[PDB]
DNA sequence: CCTGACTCG
DNA sequence: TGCGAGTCAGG
Protein backbone atom coordinates (compact mmCIF):
# COMPACT_ATOMS: atom_id res chain seq x y z
CA UNK A 1 0.00 0.00 0.00
CA UNK A 2 2.69 2.47 -1.08
CA UNK A 3 3.06 4.52 -4.27
CA UNK A 4 4.63 2.93 -7.33
CA UNK A 5 5.98 5.24 -10.04
CA UNK A 6 8.31 5.36 -13.03
CA UNK A 7 11.69 7.06 -13.08
CA UNK A 8 11.78 7.43 -16.86
CA UNK A 9 14.94 8.12 -18.85
CA UNK A 10 12.97 9.26 -21.89
CA UNK A 11 9.56 10.71 -22.77
CA UNK A 12 6.81 8.28 -23.77
CA UNK A 13 3.44 8.85 -25.44
CA UNK A 14 1.54 7.66 -22.34
CA UNK A 15 2.89 10.50 -20.19
CA UNK A 16 1.47 12.95 -22.74
CA UNK A 17 -2.25 12.42 -22.07
CA UNK A 18 -4.70 15.31 -22.51
CA UNK A 19 -5.17 15.46 -18.73
CA UNK A 20 -2.62 15.23 -15.91
CA UNK A 21 -1.22 16.62 -12.68
CA UNK A 22 2.07 18.33 -13.51
CA UNK A 23 4.95 19.23 -11.20
CA UNK A 24 7.78 21.41 -12.54
CA UNK A 25 9.87 21.85 -9.40
CA UNK A 26 11.61 25.18 -8.80
CA UNK A 27 13.12 25.12 -5.30
CA UNK A 28 14.57 28.65 -5.17
CA UNK A 29 12.09 31.02 -3.50
CA UNK A 30 12.68 33.55 -6.28
CA UNK A 31 11.88 31.50 -9.38
CA UNK A 32 13.16 34.02 -11.93
CA UNK A 33 15.82 32.34 -14.06
CA UNK A 34 15.89 29.64 -11.38
CA UNK A 35 16.75 26.00 -12.06
CA UNK A 36 14.10 23.33 -12.62
CA UNK A 37 15.29 20.41 -10.49
CA UNK A 38 12.76 17.85 -11.64
CA UNK A 39 9.48 17.08 -13.36
CA UNK A 40 6.63 14.80 -12.36
CA UNK A 41 3.58 13.71 -14.33
CA UNK A 42 0.58 11.77 -13.09
CA UNK A 43 -2.26 10.77 -15.40
CA UNK A 44 -4.69 7.92 -16.11
CA UNK A 45 -1.80 5.86 -17.50
CA UNK A 46 0.52 6.09 -14.49
CA UNK A 47 3.00 8.12 -12.46
CA UNK A 48 6.23 9.41 -14.01
CA UNK A 49 9.37 11.29 -12.98
CA UNK A 50 11.53 13.00 -15.59
CA UNK A 51 14.90 14.71 -15.31
CA UNK A 52 14.78 18.33 -16.59
CA UNK A 53 17.61 17.80 -19.09
CA UNK A 54 15.59 14.92 -20.54
CA UNK A 55 12.03 16.23 -20.69
CA UNK A 56 12.75 19.87 -21.52
CA UNK A 57 14.94 18.95 -24.49
CA UNK A 58 12.27 16.58 -25.85
CA UNK A 59 10.34 17.99 -28.83
CA UNK A 60 7.21 16.06 -27.88
CA UNK A 61 7.23 17.06 -24.21
CA UNK A 62 7.83 20.72 -25.08
CA UNK A 63 4.96 20.56 -27.58
CA UNK A 64 2.76 18.94 -24.93
CA UNK A 65 3.58 21.61 -22.33
CA UNK A 66 2.59 24.27 -24.85
CA UNK A 67 -0.57 22.51 -26.02
CA UNK A 68 -3.58 24.29 -24.50
CA UNK A 69 -5.78 21.27 -25.28
CA UNK A 70 -3.64 19.20 -22.91
CA UNK A 71 -4.99 20.13 -19.48
CA UNK A 72 -2.64 20.31 -16.50
CA UNK A 73 -3.48 20.50 -12.79
CA UNK A 74 -0.72 22.08 -10.69
CA UNK A 75 0.27 23.90 -7.50
CA UNK A 76 1.62 27.42 -8.11
CA UNK A 77 1.42 27.27 -11.91
CA UNK A 78 2.77 30.83 -12.17
CA UNK A 79 6.04 29.66 -10.58
CA UNK A 80 6.23 26.91 -13.22
CA UNK A 81 5.17 29.10 -16.14
CA UNK A 82 7.76 31.77 -15.35
CA UNK A 83 10.58 29.33 -14.63
CA UNK A 84 9.76 27.70 -17.97
CA UNK A 85 9.70 31.06 -19.76
CA UNK A 86 13.27 31.64 -18.59
CA UNK A 87 14.05 28.22 -20.04
CA UNK A 88 12.59 29.37 -23.36
CA UNK A 89 9.55 27.11 -23.04
CA UNK A 90 5.86 28.09 -23.08
CA UNK A 91 3.35 26.49 -20.69
CA UNK A 92 -0.35 26.30 -21.62
CA UNK A 93 -3.41 24.32 -20.56
CA UNK A 94 -3.30 24.90 -16.80
CA UNK A 95 -6.87 24.09 -15.78
CA UNK A 96 -6.44 23.88 -12.00
CA UNK A 97 -4.08 25.52 -9.50
CA UNK A 98 -4.21 23.97 -6.02
CA UNK A 99 -2.42 26.93 -4.42
CA UNK A 100 -5.08 29.40 -5.58
CA UNK A 101 -7.84 26.94 -4.70
CA UNK A 102 -6.53 26.62 -1.12
CA UNK A 103 -6.00 30.39 -0.93
CA UNK A 104 -9.63 31.11 -1.82
CA UNK A 105 -11.04 28.52 0.60
CA UNK A 106 -9.18 30.16 3.50
CA UNK A 107 -6.39 32.77 3.19
CA UNK A 108 -5.65 32.32 6.89
CA UNK A 109 -4.24 28.79 6.51
CA UNK A 110 -1.18 30.27 4.82
CA UNK A 111 -0.95 27.33 2.42
CA UNK A 112 2.53 27.50 0.91
CA UNK A 113 3.03 23.92 -0.30
CA UNK A 114 1.11 20.86 -1.48
CA UNK A 115 1.29 19.23 1.96
CA UNK A 116 -0.42 22.25 3.55
CA UNK A 117 -3.22 22.14 0.97
CA UNK A 118 -3.56 18.37 1.37
CA UNK A 119 -4.01 18.79 5.13
CA UNK A 120 -7.22 20.71 4.40
CA UNK A 121 -8.63 17.40 3.15
CA UNK A 122 -6.87 15.01 5.54
CA UNK A 123 -4.68 13.77 2.67
CA UNK A 124 -1.48 12.36 4.21
CA UNK A 125 0.33 10.70 1.27
CA UNK A 126 2.73 13.64 0.81
CA UNK A 127 5.43 15.42 2.79
CA UNK A 128 5.94 19.17 3.30
CA UNK A 129 8.67 20.70 1.14
CA UNK A 130 10.77 21.87 4.11
CA UNK A 131 10.93 18.30 5.42
CA UNK A 132 12.43 17.30 2.08
CA UNK A 133 14.67 20.24 1.13
CA UNK A 134 15.74 21.43 4.58
CA UNK A 135 16.01 24.89 6.14
CA UNK A 136 18.34 27.80 5.44
CA UNK A 137 21.98 26.95 4.78
CA UNK A 138 20.96 23.29 4.98
CA UNK A 139 18.49 23.69 2.12
CA UNK A 140 19.38 21.31 -0.71
CA UNK A 141 17.92 18.98 -3.34
CA UNK A 142 17.96 15.37 -2.06
CA UNK A 143 19.23 12.31 -3.94
CA UNK A 144 17.26 11.58 -7.13
CA UNK A 145 15.33 8.67 -5.57
CA UNK A 146 14.07 10.88 -2.73
CA UNK A 147 13.43 13.85 -5.03
CA UNK A 148 11.53 11.75 -7.57
CA UNK A 149 9.24 10.22 -4.96
CA UNK A 150 8.47 13.62 -3.45
CA UNK A 151 7.64 15.24 -6.79
CA UNK A 152 5.52 12.25 -7.77
CA UNK A 153 3.69 12.26 -4.42
CA UNK A 154 2.95 15.97 -4.87
CA UNK A 155 1.63 15.25 -8.37
CA UNK A 156 -0.46 12.39 -6.96
CA UNK A 157 -1.94 14.67 -4.30
CA UNK A 158 -2.86 17.34 -6.86
CA UNK A 159 -4.46 14.59 -8.96
CA UNK A 160 -6.57 13.29 -6.06
CA UNK A 161 -7.30 16.70 -4.49
CA UNK A 162 -8.66 18.56 -7.52
CA UNK A 163 -12.19 17.20 -7.27
CA UNK A 164 -12.47 17.71 -3.47
CA UNK A 165 -11.29 21.32 -3.71
CA UNK A 166 -13.46 22.22 -6.69
CA UNK A 167 -16.33 20.64 -4.75
CA UNK A 168 -15.93 22.84 -1.67
CA UNK A 169 -15.31 25.91 -3.82
CA UNK A 170 -18.58 25.32 -5.66
CA UNK A 171 -20.40 25.00 -2.33
CA UNK A 172 -18.88 28.35 -1.34
CA UNK A 173 -19.82 29.83 -4.74
CA UNK A 174 -16.10 30.38 -5.39
CA UNK A 175 -15.56 27.98 -8.28
CA UNK A 176 -15.91 30.72 -10.91
CA UNK A 177 -13.78 33.02 -8.77
CA UNK A 178 -10.98 30.47 -9.22
CA UNK A 179 -11.48 29.41 -12.85
CA UNK A 180 -12.56 32.75 -14.34
CA UNK A 181 -10.61 35.22 -12.21
CA UNK A 182 -7.58 34.03 -10.22
CA UNK A 183 -6.37 31.38 -12.68
CA UNK A 184 -6.65 33.64 -15.74
CA UNK A 185 -5.04 36.44 -13.72
CA UNK A 186 -2.18 34.11 -12.78
CA UNK A 187 -1.19 33.79 -16.45
CA UNK A 188 -1.29 37.57 -16.80
CA UNK A 189 0.93 38.09 -13.75
CA UNK A 190 3.40 35.54 -15.13
CA UNK A 191 3.70 37.64 -18.31
CA UNK A 192 4.13 40.87 -16.36
CA UNK A 193 6.81 39.39 -14.11
CA UNK A 194 8.77 37.86 -17.01
CA UNK A 195 8.59 41.08 -19.03
CA UNK A 196 10.03 43.05 -16.13
CA UNK A 197 10.57 46.80 -15.86
CA UNK A 198 13.66 48.52 -17.32
CA UNK A 199 15.82 50.65 -15.03
CA UNK A 200 18.03 53.62 -15.91
CA UNK A 201 21.03 52.52 -13.83
CA UNK A 202 23.24 55.42 -14.90
CA UNK A 203 20.69 57.87 -13.51
CA UNK A 204 19.87 55.76 -10.46
CA UNK A 205 23.57 55.48 -9.64
CA UNK A 206 24.12 59.20 -10.07
CA UNK A 207 21.17 59.85 -7.76
CA UNK A 208 22.79 57.58 -5.18
CA UNK A 209 26.09 59.43 -5.39
CA UNK A 210 24.42 62.79 -4.80
CA UNK A 211 22.11 61.37 -2.14
CA UNK A 212 25.12 60.04 -0.22
CA UNK A 213 26.58 63.56 -0.12
CA UNK A 214 23.34 65.08 1.17
CA UNK A 215 23.12 62.37 3.85
CA UNK A 216 26.62 63.12 5.11
CA UNK A 217 25.60 66.76 5.56
CA UNK A 218 22.36 66.03 7.43
CA UNK A 219 24.23 63.42 9.47
CA UNK A 220 26.92 65.83 10.65
CA UNK A 221 24.30 68.48 11.34
CA UNK A 222 22.47 66.07 13.63
CA UNK A 223 25.62 65.26 15.63
CA UNK A 224 26.28 68.99 15.92
CA UNK A 225 22.78 69.62 17.26
CA UNK A 226 23.09 66.62 19.58
CA UNK A 227 26.55 67.66 20.71
CA UNK A 228 27.46 64.01 20.24
CA UNK A 229 28.05 61.39 17.56
CA UNK A 230 25.71 58.38 17.61
CA UNK A 231 23.94 55.86 15.38
CA UNK A 232 20.90 57.75 14.09
CA UNK A 233 19.52 54.53 12.61
CA UNK A 234 19.39 53.01 16.09
CA UNK A 235 16.08 53.78 17.84
CA UNK A 236 17.75 52.70 21.09
CA UNK A 237 20.69 55.08 20.78
CA UNK A 238 18.43 57.82 19.41
CA UNK A 239 16.16 57.41 22.43
CA UNK A 240 19.01 57.96 24.86
CA UNK A 241 19.94 61.11 22.96
CA UNK A 242 16.42 62.51 22.79
CA UNK A 243 14.93 61.45 26.12
CA UNK A 244 17.96 61.23 28.37
CA UNK A 245 20.55 63.67 27.02
CA UNK A 246 18.23 66.31 25.53
CA UNK A 247 15.52 65.70 28.15
CA UNK A 248 12.66 65.76 25.65
CA UNK A 249 9.33 64.52 27.02
CA UNK A 250 8.48 60.84 26.55
CA UNK A 251 5.19 60.74 24.64
CA UNK A 252 5.17 56.99 24.06
CA UNK A 253 6.92 53.75 24.97
CA UNK A 254 6.94 50.37 23.24
CA UNK A 255 7.82 47.01 24.74
CA UNK A 256 11.52 47.66 24.09
CA UNK A 257 11.71 51.27 25.27
CA UNK A 258 11.15 54.89 24.23
CA UNK A 259 9.35 55.33 20.92
CA UNK A 260 11.08 57.46 18.25
CA UNK A 261 8.39 56.96 15.62
CA UNK A 262 7.79 59.69 13.04
CA UNK A 263 4.51 60.60 14.75
CA UNK A 264 6.27 61.07 18.09
CA UNK A 265 9.15 63.03 16.58
CA UNK A 266 6.82 65.42 14.74
CA UNK A 267 5.08 66.18 18.04
CA UNK A 268 8.48 67.00 19.55
CA UNK A 269 9.40 69.55 16.88
CA UNK A 270 8.40 72.47 19.14
CA UNK A 271 11.08 71.43 21.67
CA UNK A 272 14.20 70.95 19.56
CA UNK A 273 14.99 71.34 15.87
CA UNK A 274 17.00 68.11 15.93
CA UNK A 275 13.90 65.94 15.53
CA UNK A 276 13.08 67.43 12.12
CA UNK A 277 16.65 66.83 10.93
CA UNK A 278 16.38 63.23 12.20
CA UNK A 279 13.13 62.69 10.31
CA UNK A 280 14.75 64.00 7.13
CA UNK A 281 17.79 61.79 7.71
CA UNK A 282 15.68 58.65 8.10
CA UNK A 283 13.85 59.51 4.88
CA UNK A 284 17.02 59.91 2.84
CA UNK A 285 18.58 56.86 4.46
CA UNK A 286 15.64 54.68 3.43
CA UNK A 287 15.83 55.95 -0.14
CA UNK A 288 19.54 55.08 -0.21
CA UNK A 289 19.40 51.64 1.41
CA UNK A 290 16.25 50.48 -0.33
CA UNK A 291 15.49 52.41 -3.50
CA UNK A 292 19.07 52.94 -4.65
CA UNK A 293 21.34 50.21 -3.26
CA UNK A 294 18.64 47.62 -2.65
CA UNK A 295 17.10 48.20 -6.07
CA UNK A 296 20.46 48.08 -7.88
CA UNK A 297 21.15 44.73 -6.21
CA UNK A 298 18.20 43.08 -7.96
CA UNK A 299 18.64 44.65 -11.40
CA UNK A 300 19.59 42.04 -14.04
CA UNK A 301 22.86 43.54 -15.41
CA UNK A 302 22.52 42.27 -18.99
CA UNK A 303 19.06 43.76 -19.55
CA UNK A 304 18.85 46.38 -16.79
CA UNK A 305 15.41 45.02 -15.91
CA UNK A 306 13.96 44.19 -12.51
CA UNK A 307 11.59 41.24 -12.24
CA UNK A 308 9.25 41.38 -9.25
CA UNK A 309 7.11 38.49 -8.07
CA UNK A 310 3.47 39.19 -7.34
CA UNK A 311 2.37 36.92 -4.52
CA UNK A 312 -1.20 36.08 -5.49
CA UNK A 313 -1.91 33.82 -2.48
CA UNK A 314 -0.79 35.80 0.57
CA UNK A 315 -2.92 38.76 1.68
CA UNK A 316 -5.97 38.14 3.84
CA UNK A 317 -8.16 40.47 1.76
CA UNK A 318 -7.46 39.27 -1.76
CA UNK A 319 -4.90 41.92 -2.63
CA UNK A 320 -1.61 41.04 -4.32
CA UNK A 321 1.76 41.74 -2.70
CA UNK A 322 5.06 42.40 -4.49
CA UNK A 323 8.53 41.15 -3.52
CA UNK A 324 12.23 41.23 -4.43
CA UNK A 325 11.89 44.00 -5.37
CA UNK A 326 8.60 45.32 -4.04
CA UNK A 327 7.44 47.52 -6.90
CA UNK A 328 4.21 48.50 -5.12
CA UNK A 329 5.89 50.82 -2.60
CA UNK A 330 8.18 52.99 -4.72
CA UNK A 331 8.35 56.60 -3.38
CA UNK A 332 5.88 59.21 -4.62
CA UNK A 333 4.48 61.15 -1.63
CA UNK A 334 7.52 63.41 -1.08
CA UNK A 335 9.29 65.12 -3.99
CA UNK A 336 12.75 63.88 -2.99
CA UNK A 337 11.66 60.25 -2.96
CA UNK A 338 9.39 60.59 -6.00
CA UNK A 339 12.46 61.27 -8.15
CA UNK A 340 13.39 57.60 -7.79
CA UNK A 341 10.62 57.02 -10.34
CA UNK A 342 12.65 58.83 -13.00
CA UNK A 343 14.82 55.70 -13.05
CA UNK A 344 11.93 53.47 -14.20
CA UNK A 345 11.75 53.73 -17.99
CA UNK A 346 10.19 52.01 -21.03
CA UNK A 347 11.95 48.87 -22.26
CA UNK A 348 11.93 49.98 -25.91
CA UNK A 349 13.16 52.67 -28.32
CA UNK A 350 10.27 55.17 -28.50
CA UNK A 351 7.85 53.76 -25.94
CA UNK A 352 6.18 55.48 -22.99
CA UNK A 353 4.82 54.68 -19.54
CA UNK A 354 1.05 54.83 -19.07
CA UNK A 355 -0.51 54.74 -15.58
CA UNK A 356 -4.21 54.48 -14.67
CA UNK A 357 -5.55 54.97 -11.12
CA UNK A 358 -9.07 54.29 -9.79
CA UNK A 359 -10.50 57.48 -8.29
CA UNK A 360 -11.52 57.25 -4.60
CA UNK A 361 -11.89 53.50 -5.20
CA UNK A 362 -12.85 52.08 -1.80
CA UNK A 363 -15.20 54.97 -1.02
CA UNK A 364 -17.07 54.18 -4.24
CA UNK A 365 -17.09 50.49 -3.35
CA UNK A 366 -18.32 51.35 0.14
CA UNK A 367 -21.07 53.54 -1.32
CA UNK A 368 -22.27 50.59 -3.40
CA UNK A 369 -22.14 48.00 -0.63
CA UNK A 370 -23.55 50.27 2.07
CA UNK A 371 -26.01 51.87 -0.35
CA UNK A 372 -25.49 55.21 1.42
CA UNK A 373 -27.66 57.79 -0.35
CA UNK A 374 -25.48 60.80 0.44
CA UNK A 375 -22.27 59.01 -0.53
CA UNK A 376 -23.77 57.52 -3.70
CA UNK A 377 -25.19 60.91 -4.65
CA UNK A 378 -21.74 62.46 -4.16
CA UNK A 379 -20.18 60.18 -6.77
CA UNK A 380 -23.15 60.57 -9.09
CA UNK A 381 -22.37 64.28 -8.90
CA UNK A 382 -18.71 63.43 -9.51
CA UNK A 383 -17.49 65.09 -6.32
CA UNK A 384 -14.19 64.47 -4.54
CA UNK A 385 -14.76 63.45 -0.92
CA UNK A 386 -11.02 63.62 -0.24
CA UNK A 387 -10.86 67.23 -1.40
CA UNK A 388 -14.07 68.09 0.46
CA UNK A 389 -12.73 66.51 3.66
CA UNK A 390 -9.50 68.43 3.07
CA UNK A 391 -11.47 71.68 2.79
CA UNK A 392 -13.15 71.02 6.14
CA UNK A 393 -10.11 69.77 8.08
CA UNK A 394 -7.91 72.63 6.88
CA UNK A 395 -10.83 75.07 6.76
CA UNK A 396 -9.87 76.23 3.26
CA UNK A 397 -11.47 76.68 -0.16
CA UNK A 398 -11.42 74.00 -2.86
CA UNK A 399 -8.93 75.85 -5.06
CA UNK A 400 -6.53 76.14 -2.12
CA UNK A 401 -6.44 72.40 -1.39
CA UNK A 402 -2.94 71.17 -2.27
CA UNK A 403 -2.08 67.60 -3.36
CA UNK A 404 -0.50 67.00 0.04
CA UNK A 405 -3.58 68.27 1.87
CA UNK A 406 -5.86 66.04 -0.19
CA UNK A 407 -3.59 63.10 0.59
CA UNK A 408 -3.82 63.80 4.32
CA UNK A 409 -7.60 64.11 4.03
CA UNK A 410 -7.70 60.84 2.08
CA UNK A 411 -5.96 59.12 5.00
CA UNK A 412 -8.52 60.70 7.32
CA UNK A 413 -11.49 59.59 5.20
CA UNK A 414 -10.45 55.95 5.17
CA UNK A 415 -9.37 55.99 8.80
CA UNK A 416 -12.84 57.13 9.83
CA UNK A 417 -14.92 54.81 7.63
CA UNK A 418 -12.73 51.95 8.84
CA UNK A 419 -13.20 52.60 12.55
CA UNK A 420 -10.44 54.92 13.77
CA UNK A 421 -11.10 56.08 17.34
CA UNK A 422 -11.33 59.67 18.53
CA UNK A 423 -7.97 59.06 20.19
CA UNK A 424 -6.33 57.90 16.98
CA UNK A 425 -7.74 60.75 14.92
CA UNK A 426 -6.82 63.39 17.50
CA UNK A 427 -3.29 61.97 17.53
CA UNK A 428 -2.97 61.87 13.74
CA UNK A 429 -4.21 65.43 13.23
CA UNK A 430 -2.61 66.48 16.51
CA UNK A 431 -5.93 68.02 17.56
CA UNK A 432 -8.27 67.92 20.55
CA UNK A 433 -9.76 64.51 21.31
CA UNK A 434 -13.18 66.08 21.86
CA UNK A 435 -13.09 67.82 18.48
CA UNK A 436 -11.94 64.57 16.88
CA UNK A 437 -14.88 62.75 18.45
CA UNK A 438 -17.29 65.44 17.24
CA UNK A 439 -15.79 65.28 13.75
CA UNK A 440 -16.26 61.50 13.63
CA UNK A 441 -19.79 61.69 15.03
CA UNK A 442 -20.65 64.39 12.50
CA UNK A 443 -18.98 62.35 9.75
CA UNK A 444 -21.37 59.44 10.24
CA UNK A 445 -24.34 61.76 10.69
CA UNK A 446 -23.66 62.82 7.10
CA UNK A 447 -23.11 59.23 5.97
CA UNK A 448 -25.70 57.36 8.11
CA UNK A 449 -25.88 54.56 5.57
CA UNK A 450 -22.19 53.80 6.04
CA UNK A 451 -22.58 53.82 9.81
CA UNK A 452 -25.39 51.26 9.83
CA UNK A 453 -23.61 49.11 7.25
CA UNK A 454 -20.56 48.94 9.49
CA UNK A 455 -22.75 48.07 12.46
CA UNK A 456 -24.60 45.38 10.47
CA UNK A 457 -21.53 43.81 8.84
CA UNK A 458 -20.02 43.34 12.30
CA UNK A 459 -23.16 41.59 13.56
CA UNK A 460 -23.26 39.42 10.43
CA UNK A 461 -19.63 38.38 10.92
CA UNK A 462 -20.35 37.42 14.53
CA UNK A 463 -23.21 35.21 13.36
CA UNK A 464 -21.54 33.63 10.30
CA UNK A 465 -17.92 33.65 11.42
CA UNK A 466 -16.68 35.14 8.14
CA UNK A 467 -17.27 37.99 5.68
CA UNK A 468 -17.31 38.03 1.88
CA UNK A 469 -16.55 40.28 -1.09
CA UNK A 470 -18.48 41.21 -4.24
CA UNK A 471 -17.00 38.28 -6.18
CA UNK A 472 -17.39 35.90 -3.23
CA UNK A 473 -13.87 36.02 -1.83
CA UNK A 474 -13.98 35.00 1.82
CA UNK A 475 -12.20 35.69 5.12
CA UNK A 476 -12.93 33.90 8.39
CA UNK A 477 -12.88 35.81 11.67
CA UNK A 478 -13.04 33.32 14.57
CA UNK A 479 -11.89 35.98 17.07
CA UNK A 480 -15.02 38.04 16.34
CA UNK A 481 -16.74 36.55 19.41
CA UNK A 482 -13.75 36.55 21.75
CA UNK A 483 -14.04 37.41 25.45
CA UNK A 484 -11.03 39.72 25.18
CA UNK A 485 -12.04 43.24 24.13
CA UNK A 486 -8.82 43.87 22.24
CA UNK A 487 -8.90 40.57 20.34
CA UNK A 488 -12.59 41.08 19.47
CA UNK A 489 -12.24 44.72 18.43
CA UNK A 490 -9.51 43.86 15.94
CA UNK A 491 -11.73 41.19 14.42
CA UNK A 492 -14.67 43.59 14.25
CA UNK A 493 -12.57 46.15 12.39
CA UNK A 494 -11.47 43.46 9.93
CA UNK A 495 -15.16 42.79 9.30
CA UNK A 496 -15.57 46.49 8.51
CA UNK A 497 -12.59 46.70 6.16
CA UNK A 498 -12.06 43.34 4.45
CA UNK A 499 -15.28 43.35 2.39
CA UNK A 500 -14.43 46.80 0.99
CA UNK A 501 -10.70 46.43 0.34
CA UNK A 502 -11.39 42.89 -0.82
CA UNK A 503 -14.08 43.90 -3.30
CA UNK A 504 -11.76 46.63 -4.60
CA UNK A 505 -9.19 43.89 -5.20
CA UNK A 506 -11.76 41.74 -7.02
CA UNK A 507 -12.56 44.65 -9.31
CA UNK A 508 -9.03 45.55 -10.39
CA UNK A 509 -8.26 41.86 -10.91
CA UNK A 510 -11.21 41.54 -13.29
CA UNK A 511 -10.10 44.77 -14.96
CA UNK A 512 -6.68 43.28 -15.67
CA UNK A 513 -8.25 40.25 -17.36
CA UNK A 514 -10.57 42.37 -19.50
CA UNK A 515 -7.76 44.77 -20.43
CA UNK A 516 -5.29 42.04 -21.36
CA UNK A 517 -8.00 40.57 -23.61
CA UNK A 518 -8.81 43.92 -25.23
CA UNK A 519 -5.13 44.65 -25.87
CA UNK A 520 -4.46 41.32 -27.58
CA UNK A 521 -7.60 41.52 -29.73
CA UNK A 522 -6.58 44.94 -31.05
CA UNK A 523 -3.06 43.58 -31.61
CA UNK A 524 -1.68 46.53 -29.62
CA UNK A 525 1.95 46.27 -28.52
CA UNK A 526 1.04 47.88 -25.19
CA UNK A 527 1.37 45.50 -22.27
CA UNK A 528 0.93 45.50 -18.50
CA UNK A 529 4.03 45.99 -16.36
CA UNK A 530 2.70 46.50 -12.84
CA UNK A 531 -0.41 46.51 -10.66
CA UNK A 532 -0.35 48.70 -7.56
CA UNK A 533 -3.58 47.71 -5.77
CA UNK A 534 -5.90 50.14 -7.57
CA UNK A 535 -3.70 51.29 -10.43
CA UNK A 536 -2.37 49.63 -13.58
CA UNK A 537 0.90 50.57 -15.26
CA UNK A 538 1.74 49.79 -18.86
CA UNK A 539 4.40 50.62 -21.42
CA UNK A 540 3.72 51.09 -25.12
CA UNK A 541 5.01 52.77 -28.27
CA UNK A 542 4.16 56.49 -28.40
CA UNK A 543 1.77 55.86 -31.31
CA UNK A 544 -0.51 53.82 -29.05
CA UNK A 545 -1.01 56.49 -26.40
CA UNK A 546 -4.11 57.82 -28.17
CA UNK A 547 -5.92 54.48 -28.00
CA UNK A 548 -4.80 53.72 -24.44
CA UNK A 549 -6.10 57.07 -23.18
CA UNK A 550 -9.55 55.73 -24.01
CA UNK A 551 -9.24 51.93 -23.92
CA UNK A 552 -7.61 51.61 -20.50
CA UNK A 553 -9.99 53.90 -18.59
CA UNK A 554 -13.02 52.36 -20.32
CA UNK A 555 -12.12 48.75 -19.50
CA UNK A 556 -11.23 49.57 -15.88
CA UNK A 557 -14.39 51.63 -15.39
CA UNK A 558 -16.58 48.91 -16.93
CA UNK A 559 -14.94 46.00 -15.08
CA UNK A 560 -17.98 45.74 -12.82
CA UNK A 561 -21.25 47.65 -12.58
CA UNK A 562 -21.96 49.26 -9.22
CA UNK A 563 -24.71 51.56 -7.97
CA UNK A 564 -22.18 54.36 -8.42
CA UNK A 565 -19.91 55.02 -11.41
CA UNK A 566 -16.23 54.06 -11.43
CA UNK A 567 -13.81 56.81 -12.45
CA UNK A 568 -10.22 56.39 -13.63
CA UNK A 569 -7.43 58.99 -13.66
CA UNK A 570 -4.55 58.43 -16.08
CA UNK A 571 -1.32 59.94 -17.41
CA UNK A 572 1.73 58.96 -19.46
CA UNK A 573 5.32 60.04 -20.10
CA UNK A 574 8.93 59.12 -20.82
CA UNK A 575 9.41 57.74 -17.29
CA UNK A 576 7.21 56.37 -14.51
CA UNK A 577 7.82 59.72 -12.77
CA UNK A 578 6.29 61.63 -15.68
CA UNK A 579 3.22 59.38 -15.72
CA UNK A 580 1.57 61.99 -13.49
C1' DC B 581 16.35 36.09 14.17
C1' DC B 582 13.64 39.91 16.25
C1' DT B 583 11.90 45.15 16.44
C1' DG B 584 11.15 49.55 14.73
C1' DA B 585 12.05 52.52 11.29
C1' DC B 586 10.83 53.79 6.36
C1' DT B 587 7.88 52.96 1.92
C1' DC B 588 3.20 52.26 -0.71
C1' DG B 589 -2.03 51.24 -1.49
C1' DT C 590 -7.92 53.16 20.32
C1' DG C 591 -8.52 52.57 11.03
C1' DC C 592 -7.04 48.40 7.23
C1' DG C 593 -3.67 45.74 3.80
C1' DA C 594 1.32 45.05 2.48
C1' DG C 595 7.60 44.70 2.08
C1' DT C 596 12.58 45.91 3.04
C1' DC C 597 16.04 47.74 5.66
C1' DA C 598 19.69 48.66 9.80
C1' DG C 599 20.56 47.69 14.39
C1' DG C 600 20.05 44.67 18.40
Ligand SMILES: Cc1cn([C@H]2CC[C@@H](COP(=O)(O)OP(=O)(O)OP(=O)(O)O)O2)c(=O)[nH]c1=O
Nearest residue numbers: 357358359360361362363410411414534589592
Ligand atom coordinates in the same frame (compact mmCIF):
# COMPACT_ATOMS: atom_id res chain seq x y z
C1 LIG D 1 -3.74 56.04 0.58
C2 LIG D 1 -4.58 54.99 1.30
C3 LIG D 1 -5.17 53.96 0.58
N1 LIG D 1 -5.94 52.99 1.24
C4 LIG D 1 -6.65 51.93 0.48
C5 LIG D 1 -8.08 52.40 0.22
C6 LIG D 1 -7.85 53.27 -1.02
C7 LIG D 1 -6.99 52.26 -1.79
C8 LIG D 1 -6.30 52.89 -3.00
O1 LIG D 1 -5.45 53.97 -2.59
P1 LIG D 1 -5.62 55.42 -3.27
O2 LIG D 1 -4.48 56.35 -2.62
O3 LIG D 1 -5.54 55.39 -4.75
O4 LIG D 1 -7.01 56.00 -2.73
P2 LIG D 1 -8.16 56.60 -3.70
O5 LIG D 1 -9.27 56.61 -2.53
O6 LIG D 1 -8.16 55.59 -4.78
O7 LIG D 1 -7.45 58.03 -3.86
P3 LIG D 1 -7.23 58.69 -5.31
O8 LIG D 1 -8.66 59.31 -5.72
O9 LIG D 1 -6.96 57.47 -6.33
O10 LIG D 1 -6.14 59.69 -5.31
O11 LIG D 1 -6.05 51.78 -0.81
C9 LIG D 1 -6.10 53.06 2.63
O12 LIG D 1 -6.76 52.19 3.21
N2 LIG D 1 -5.51 54.09 3.35
C10 LIG D 1 -4.75 55.06 2.68
O13 LIG D 1 -4.26 56.00 3.32
Ligand SMILES: OC[C@H]1O[C@@](CO)(O[C@H]2O[C@H](CO)[C@@H](O)[C@H](O)[C@H]2O)[C@@H](O)[C@@H]1O
Nearest residue numbers: 029030076079112113309311312313323
Ligand atom coordinates in the same frame (compact mmCIF):
# COMPACT_ATOMS: atom_id res chain seq x y z
O1 LIG E 1 5.80 31.36 -6.16
C1 LIG E 1 5.14 32.25 -5.27
C2 LIG E 1 4.31 31.45 -4.24
O2 LIG E 1 5.22 30.63 -3.46
C3 LIG E 1 5.01 30.86 -2.04
C4 LIG E 1 5.19 29.46 -1.36
O3 LIG E 1 4.31 28.47 -1.89
O4 LIG E 1 6.06 31.78 -1.61
C5 LIG E 1 7.47 31.57 -1.94
O5 LIG E 1 7.90 32.51 -3.01
C6 LIG E 1 7.76 33.96 -2.74
C7 LIG E 1 8.28 34.70 -3.99
O6 LIG E 1 9.69 34.54 -4.12
C8 LIG E 1 8.51 34.35 -1.40
O7 LIG E 1 8.22 35.68 -0.99
C9 LIG E 1 8.09 33.39 -0.23
O8 LIG E 1 8.92 33.62 0.90
C10 LIG E 1 8.37 31.82 -0.69
O9 LIG E 1 7.98 30.97 0.39
C11 LIG E 1 3.59 31.44 -1.94
O10 LIG E 1 3.39 32.26 -0.78
C12 LIG E 1 3.49 32.27 -3.22
O11 LIG E 1 2.14 32.50 -3.59
Ligand SMILES: [Mn+2]
Nearest residue numbers: 357358359534
Ligand atom coordinates in the same frame (compact mmCIF):
# COMPACT_ATOMS: atom_id res chain seq x y z
MN1 LIG F 1 -6.88 55.46 -6.48
